[PDB]
Structures are given as structure tokens and as C-alpha cells.
Amino acid sequence: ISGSCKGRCFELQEAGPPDCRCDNLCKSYTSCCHDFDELCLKTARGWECTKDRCGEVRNEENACHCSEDCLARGDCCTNYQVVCKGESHWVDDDCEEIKAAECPAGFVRPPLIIFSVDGFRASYMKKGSKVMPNIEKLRSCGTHSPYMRPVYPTKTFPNLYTLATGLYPESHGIVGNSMYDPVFDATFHLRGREKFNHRWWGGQPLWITATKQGVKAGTFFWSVVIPHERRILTILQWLTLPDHERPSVYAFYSEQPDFSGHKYGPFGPEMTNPLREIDKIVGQLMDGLKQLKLHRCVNVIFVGDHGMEDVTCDRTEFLSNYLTNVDDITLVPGTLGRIRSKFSNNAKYDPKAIIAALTCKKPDQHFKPYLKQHLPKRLHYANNRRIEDIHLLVERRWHVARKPLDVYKCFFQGDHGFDNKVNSMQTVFVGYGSTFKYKTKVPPFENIELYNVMCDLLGLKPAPNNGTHGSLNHLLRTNTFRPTMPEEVTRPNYPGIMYLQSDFDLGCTCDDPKNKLDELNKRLHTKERHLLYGRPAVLYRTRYDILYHTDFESGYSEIFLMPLWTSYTVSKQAEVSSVPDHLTSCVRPDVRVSPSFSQNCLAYKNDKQMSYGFLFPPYLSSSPEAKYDAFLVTNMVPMYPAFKRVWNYFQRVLVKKYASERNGVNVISGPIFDYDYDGLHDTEDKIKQYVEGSSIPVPTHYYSIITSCLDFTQPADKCDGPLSVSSFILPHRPDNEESCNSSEDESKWVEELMKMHTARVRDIEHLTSLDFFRKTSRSYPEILTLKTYLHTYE
Ligand SMILES: *[C@@H]1O[C@H](CO)[C@@H](O[C@@H]2O[C@H](CO)[C@@H](O[C@@H]3O[C@H](CO)[C@@H](O)[C@H](O)[C@@H]3O)[C@H](O)[C@H]2NC(C)=O)[C@H](O)[C@H]1NC(C)=O
Ligand SMILES: CC(C)CCC[C@@H](C)[C@H]1CC[C@H]2[C@@H]3[C@H](O)C=C4C[C@@H](O)CC[C@]4(C)[C@H]3CC[C@]12C
Ligand SMILES: CCCCCn1cc(-c2cc(=O)c3c(O)cc(O)cc3o2)c2ccccc21
Ligand SMILES: [Ca+2]
Ligand SMILES: [Zn+2]
Ligand SMILES: [Zn+2]
């Protein structure tokens, strides 16, 4: 029927204007029918049955019913079985393991109910079951992690869509709660109707994926006027539909505890009550599922999108305090900063001048300017036209605004959007049901990994996303997906001594009784190692060679004229030698690689802006005889003199620090070329910078994977079990403007710079098209979880 909303409340089909919309989103489109409020939003007698209502005469106007007829219809209050038939609340029951789904007849698969909460700080869980009995049971009974890492910017819409797609915001297009698209020439906003236009949303969210493969979805979204209790009743009724009509995946959104978090702050004593009200709803969902004989059938995912941090109006940096004129720019303010020109026809707008006027211009400055391609690669926040070039990384607890006149109501005590590695931004994840594990705790993970898990829970083939499928298989009791290691594309060459030193005119010079001392060591004793996890696989068509040495091993690339990876192991008792002055400028030819596929020294001498470093540091040679291997022309990579300060301190000081701390470490280092900042390995054509007068490409970044045993009582090269990893993708910049303490000694800023650019092993793999940890004796799902690990230092 059209013009009326009878027999249609929260329907799962559509026709359009003029026929009414009776679904749960008609209120948002301002196009419900006239009887919607009295037919679909009934609210008489509340949401809980009482004892006198047990067996009532079914009065149609009630919100939920307590008659004996209601369970056949499926519209009872969630506590019917409790206050009438003597059943107990789902929380009051003991934890019974679900070794197999106990679904009623007609259920061809366990349904998935996603319970999302806005701004649910990860630390909110430590309030205990005195405040959140239902949620705490799910957490302790099912599968949970200490926290879950959101995506930058840690805002509502980018994360909620990242949850639905498994994509970074730069890939699915929702790069913020409000954004400007220069192609559309329109402005996306949280409030308004512009967000309903499909042109803003990329990728393939879960409900579209389920529908495209035959799995019925049902609307994930709810207009804010529909109370939470009615949303649960609607989800519980949908499960009572016939088999050919019942959807398999459901969703429930809650604006809490983010609503009250903005008003009172995260650690305010008022925060306890909104959590209690949330647990009431989770209890209503569980009691209603147990009432429907589905508590041992469904899978429930209790998930948040971001955390919460203390912010105040008194803590606001203003661009008017740094820029001589702020009336010619547009700023996206708040917990993050994006700057674009207010007028396109303006040549007086200089992006160079704006970055300089904001870079280390005042002590205790609570923001850092960035060209978007220079942000930490772990953020994956650049490859999109809606992301402005100038980006401001705002310190936790602080805000950035354009001028004091723009701020007004303090209209807040908490906010979010900061760097997603900040503690306050971490959120929660709880997996409970017949497919999640029982009383099992998993290590923290990123929310881009959930879309593959939800597709596996529904038997769907996931759309291409940025999760590493298989790295969360340890969340499930049984796994239908079984990951495959990528096959090698380019087999390596193992060249021997093919040329003579006379065949080389690279322009390199190097000089030539420690040997008798080394032999007196070796001879007078009473009693491979550098590639502990199998050589990396090259996942693209190229030409490269495996070069063995005493102290290190490298996959030298004849196309890029430098190694793709350099592997060496540093013992706990490894000594750090120096380099004599007559070997400081020494570079030796490698008689295993053709002179035509070798770097030349003359190119570095002509490029006044460019120097060169080494992938294996000569400072860590086992002997002066072996030190000559480190000076091979196949071991040098081009580095700016400013970056050499960062590289030298890392190799000469920090690798020895890590080995002494972690019972030896295995280092795998190499270059990264990402000139179009899309997070993927660039081919030769995209490289936009070379060494002057040569074909030696200049890397945009340099990486290093530091691996050791998790059981530190064993060395790095005799590790019987799990592995501990930590990696970084350092930007190869010609200046150290990113570090305001760069004038001081390296021990006062370099380590801080490296913690900022930490990265998962998976991040390096996308940027290098290599595959690591291939021969380790760990199950491949375990290795995938190791590659997704991000050492966050908090
Ligand atoms: C995160 O995941 C997404 C999707 O898996 C990745 O984006 C994908 O990037 C590839 C290559 O950049 C795109 O494929 C291209 O398709 C065109 C035809 O449309 C073709 O001409 C090209 O040669 C290439 O094959 C793909 O469309 C694109 N998909 C989406 C949804 O954006 C992205 O690279 C991943 N990011 C990271 C950091 O891993
Ligand atoms: C209470 C309101 C503020 C909630 C706002 C709902 C809005 C974010 C939802 C409503 C309908 C959604 C779109 C619809 O499901 C169709 C798809 C196709 C898919 O390929 C990409 C996503 C997209 C466009 C959905 C985007 C988000 C929407 C607008
Ligand atoms: C598979 C992962 C589950 C999450 C799916 N998911 C729910 C969204 C939602 C629904 C609301 O009910 C809602 C509201 O009532 C007020 C409000 O301000 C925003 C709101 O957003 C949403 C938005 C963008 C991308 C994805 C999304
Ligand atoms: Ca790239
Ligand atoms: Zn949110
Ligand atoms: Zn918020």
C-alpha cells in the first residue's frame, strides 16, 4: 500500500516518491508516511514487561507486548521470558562454550549482528562489570583484544566506513567528517543532505557485498529519532521473518559514549551513566536473542570507531599567530588541520611560505606542518584529491584554528581525530558467538582487518581491501579462509666472480698486520646466520642478484642499481668498530655485477646536493678484512647529507642498542620509491629524481625490519618459537626540518624521529613488492599477524 504505512513498518523494500518510505531511514530523507510515527514508533508502557502485563490482552498501540501470542509474532519485550516464564537474564547465565552453532530450524547460517558504539575509549573497559555487566560478559566469554587501532583521522565517518569496507580513508574517499572535492566543487559535511549523495563513497561496503552475492543485508542505518530500544526490537523481529526473507547480517549504531564524552571529557565522573545505558541495550539484545533461542547461534561484534581525549578551548593554536595573512587560506580546523587556498585565481598564495611560517617557529608548538606526501607512511593519508597538500598533525589534547574570532560556544571537554597511534584514540573490539573463540584474548589489531573477518562469517568473498586476509584467523573457532603465500615472480641470479677489476671505470678509489691477528684468533680456539627467515620474494618482473658476504647478504637489483634488501644479524655481544680515515672515502667495485649495472662514484661527486650511505654499515664488520665488503659499490645507496645524520646514528648506535636489548637482532634494510605517494612500489617511470647525470634513482624512503625472538632468553638466530618485530619507514628528506631539535646532537632527536615513522612489515611490503618471513616454522596465519604488528611505543 502507498500513502499509508500499515503492514510496512521497517520494511526491507523500496519504491520511492510518491509511495511512502517506511524503512528506518525515511526520517533522514524527510519522506516517511503520515502514520509512521503512530504505527512504527509506538512507545506505550515503555520497553520492559511487568508482572501484571504478563498475559495481557494484546493492545495494538503498545511498544512491545507481553501476551502469550507475542512470541509467535516476535514482538515481545526482551524481558518477557524473565518476568513471566521464569527465565533468567542472559548475563546471569554461566559461560558455556559453543563448540557448534545451535541454531533453530530454517537457519542456513549463523546471523551476524554488528554492535557499533561512537567514541568508545578502550580504557572504558576497565570500569568493570559493576557498570557494564552485559558487555563485560561478552568480553570475557567471547573473543576480545586489549584495544583496537582506528584509522587516521580518528573521526566518526572515516572509521565507520573503514569498518564497512576494510579500506584506508584515502582509498574509499571518506577522508574526514567534512571534506572538499575539487572535481565536484562541493563540500561534504556531517550535518546536511550532501553526505547522502553516492558520489562521495567509494569501495564496496559490507551490505553491498552481501547483497551482490545473494546474502540479504537489511538496513544498517537508523535515523537518530528512532530510540535504541526500538532498533533492537526491529532487529529481533527481522530474525523471526521467513527463511527467504530473513537477512543474515545486522547493524546497530549508537551515538554514545561519544555524545556525553564531548560534554564531560573521557575521565569525567559523568561518563559512568552513558555506559550503563549502553549496557542496558546490549542486555536487551542478548535477552531478546536468548528469548529467540539464538544466543548460542548468532555472532555479535561489539566494536568502536575511535577513542576520546581531553581537550579544552584554552588549548587552541591559532594560525593568525604564525601567518602574516590568514584571509587568503581555508582551514579545516579541530583535532587536525588541512589548509587550501581560499581563492584559486591567486598567485600570491605560496604553499612553500605557509609550511615555512609554521615550521619550528615558536617553542612548545602544539602542531607540526606536513606536505601530505611527507606524513608518516603508516597513516596512509595522501593518495586522494580530497586531501589537501598542507596537513597539520595536531598534538594530543590540543586544537588548531584559523583565528580567535572563529572559535565560539567551552563548547566541549573532549574530542578525537589525532594521530591514530595515540593511546586515547584506541577503541574496543569484542567478538562473541558460535564462530568466535571461547574465553580467548587476541593481540590488538587495526580495524581495516575486520571486513575480511565479517565476510568470512557470512561466507562472502571480500572485495579487494587493505586488510591482510588470514591475519585474524586466530579470532575464529573455525576458519573457511586459508591464506596463500604469494609465489615468487623473479627468480634470483647467484653470480660468481665474472669480471676483473680492470673492467671497471666507475671512478671509485679505495686503498688496500690485522690478518695475522685475525688468524691468531681463529687458529687458537677450542670450539645462513644472516638470512634467518628465508630470502625475500620479489613479486614483480625484474632482474636482481643474490650477493653473499661474510657479514651480510643482499638482493642487488640490476634495474635500480642498488639492493632491494640487505640482511645481517647482530649478536648481543657484537662490537661496534670505527672506520680508518684512509677508508672513509673508499668504494670498491663488485666483480660479480657488470660495470653497466653498477653505480659510479663520479655521479656522486658531480651531484653537490647528494652523498651516499651503505645498507650494511662498515661500523659493524666482524673484521677489517670483511670490512672491505661493506665498501662494495653494490652496497651503497644515495643519501642526502642531512639524512646521513639519521642513518649514521641508526646504524652505528641504535642497532647495537637493539641487539643488546633484545638478545641480538636481524636487520633487513633497503630503499623505497613512492613518488606518487599511493603506498605502492613505483616502477621506473614514476621516479622523478635521480643522481645528477646518472640513472641512479633517489629513494623517497629507507626501511629496516628489526626481528628477534619473542622469548628473549634465546638469541635471534636460535629462536624456537614466536618472533618479535619492529620496523620503520624513514623519509629520505634533504633537510631535518621535521625535527625541531635537529641542531642538537643525534641522541636528542633522531630516535624520536624514528618512533614517529614506525611501520608494519606489511606497509614495507606494499612499498617494495617484496615478501618477508617465508621460511620460519611458524604457521602462515601467525606470520601474517606478525606482519600486521605496529610497534607504537604506547
Ligand atoms: C588498498 O586497497 C585498494 C583496493 O584493494 C587499493 O586500490 C587499488 O589500487 C589498484 C592499483 O593502484 C587499482 O587497480 C587499477 O585498476 C585500473 C582499472 O580501474 C587499472 O588500469 C590499473 O592498472 C590498476 O590495475 C584498484 O582499482 C584500486 N582499488 C580501489 C578500491 O581503490 C590500494 O592500492 C590499497 N592500498 C594499499 C596501501 O595497499
Ligand atoms: C541517521 C543518518 C545521519 C545516517 C546517514 C546514512 C548514510 C551515511 C547512508 C544512508 C544510505 C548509504 C549509501 C547506500 O547504502 C548505497 C551505497 C553504495 C556503495 O557502493 C557505496 C556506499 C553507499 C553509497 C552508501 C553510503 C552511505 C549511506 C549514504
Ligand atoms: C560494517 C560496519 C558497521 C557500521 C556501518 N555504518 C553505520 C553508520 C551510521 C548509522 C547511524 O545510525 C548514524 C546516526 O544515527 C547518527 C549519525 O550522526 C551517524 C550515523 O551513522 C555509517 C556511516 C558511514 C559508513 C558506515 C556506517
Ligand atoms: Ca607508489
Ligand atoms: Zn565516531
Ligand atoms: Zn565525536
Coordinates of N, CA and C in Angstrom, one line a residue, residues 42-49 53 56 58-67 70 75-79 230 233:
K42 N 5.8 3.2 18.1 CA 5.0 3.1 19.3 C 5.9 3.1 20.5
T43 N 5.4 3.7 21.6 CA 6.2 3.8 22.8 C 5.4 3.7 24.1
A44 N 4.2 3.1 24.0 CA 3.4 3.0 25.2 C 3.9 1.9 26.2
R45 N 3.8 2.2 27.5 CA 4.3 1.3 28.5 C 5.8 1.0 28.5
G46 N 6.5 1.7 27.7 CA 8.0 1.5 27.8 C 8.4 0.3 27.0
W47 N 9.6 -0.2 27.4 CA 10.3 -1.3 26.7 C 10.4 -2.6 27.5
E48 N 10.0 -2.6 28.8 CA 10.1 -3.8 29.7 C 8.7 -4.3 30.1
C49 N 8.5 -5.6 30.0 CA 7.3 -6.1 30.5 C 7.3 -6.0 32.0
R53 N 1.5 -7.2 33.4 CA 1.3 -7.2 32.0 C 1.5 -8.7 31.4
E56 N -1.3 -10.1 29.0 CA -2.3 -9.0 28.8 C -3.1 -9.3 27.6
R58 N -3.8 -8.3 24.1 CA -2.9 -7.7 23.1 C -3.5 -6.3 22.7
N59 N -3.0 -5.2 23.2 CA -3.4 -3.9 22.8 C -2.4 -3.4 21.8
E60 N -2.9 -3.1 20.6 CA -2.0 -2.9 19.4 C -1.1 -1.6 19.6
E61 N -1.5 -0.6 20.4 CA -0.8 0.6 20.5 C 0.5 0.5 21.3
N62 N 0.8 -0.6 21.9 CA 1.9 -0.7 22.8 C 3.2 -0.8 22.0
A63 N 4.3 -0.4 22.7 CA 5.6 -0.5 22.1 C 6.0 -2.0 21.9
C64 N 6.1 -2.7 23.0 CA 6.3 -4.2 22.9 C 5.2 -4.9 23.8
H65 N 5.0 -6.1 23.5 CA 3.9 -6.9 24.0 C 4.3 -7.9 25.0
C66 N 3.4 -8.3 25.9 CA 3.6 -9.3 26.9 C 2.6 -10.4 26.9
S67 N 1.8 -10.5 25.9 CA 0.8 -11.5 25.8 C 1.4 -12.9 25.4
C70 N 2.7 -13.2 21.6 CA 3.7 -12.3 21.0 C 4.9 -13.1 20.4
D75 N 7.3 -9.9 18.7 CA 7.3 -8.5 19.1 C 7.1 -8.4 20.6
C76 N 7.8 -9.2 21.4 CA 7.7 -9.1 22.8 C 8.8 -8.2 23.3
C77 N 8.6 -7.7 24.5 CA 9.7 -7.0 25.2 C 10.7 -8.0 25.6
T78 N 12.0 -7.6 25.5 CA 13.1 -8.5 25.6 C 13.1 -9.3 27.0
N79 N 12.4 -8.8 28.0 CA 12.4 -9.4 29.3 C 11.1 -10.2 29.5
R230 N 13.9 0.6 20.3 CA 13.1 0.3 19.1 C 14.0 -0.4 18.0
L233 N 14.4 -4.0 19.0 CA 13.1 -4.7 18.7 C 13.0 -4.9 17.2

